Amino acid sequence: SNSYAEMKFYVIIRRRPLFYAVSLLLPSIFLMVVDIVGFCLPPDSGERVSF
Amino acid sequence: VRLVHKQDLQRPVPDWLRHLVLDRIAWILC
């Protein structure tokens, strides 16, 4: 005995994976290659551990 | 720092001894 009218609007939005790209993957690979540089340090030095 | 260290191994190769301690030394001195 009581019916109401609905008009739905589905707004569909997609994110732009650019601002979150650099801010995420770049520092990770940076510290990664810095660690790779860190392997070149001889175990005898001792500064490798602190590295 | 990998180059200069006491690891009780090896000897300086003459081929790269002349290239660095002789030639590059004169090149750097000037």
Side-chain angles (χ1 to χ4, degrees), chain A, chain B residues 1-7 9-12 14 16 26:
Chain A
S1 75
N2 291 96
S3 52
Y4 301 96
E6 282 188 0
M7 181 61 78
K8 272 178 179 283
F9 285 86
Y10 303 105
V11 40
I12 290 97
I13 51 166
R14 184 168 60 187
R15 199 188 298 267
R16 315 276 269 274
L18 292 183
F19 174 61
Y20 302 106
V22 41
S23 303
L24 267 296
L25 57 93
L26 179 65
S28 298
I29 59 101
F30 158 76
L31 279 97
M32 205 58 61
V33 306
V34 173
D35 185 69
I36 301 300
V37 175
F39 289 104
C40 308
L41 267 167
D44 294 343
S45 294
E47 296 299 323
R48 192 192 205 242
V49 189
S50 179
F51 193 117
Chain B
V1 90
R2 220 202 188 273
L3 259 64
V4 43
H5 196 50
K6 255 268 214 58
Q7 295 181 156
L9 265 55
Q10 310 239 350
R11 273 204 186 177
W16 331 121

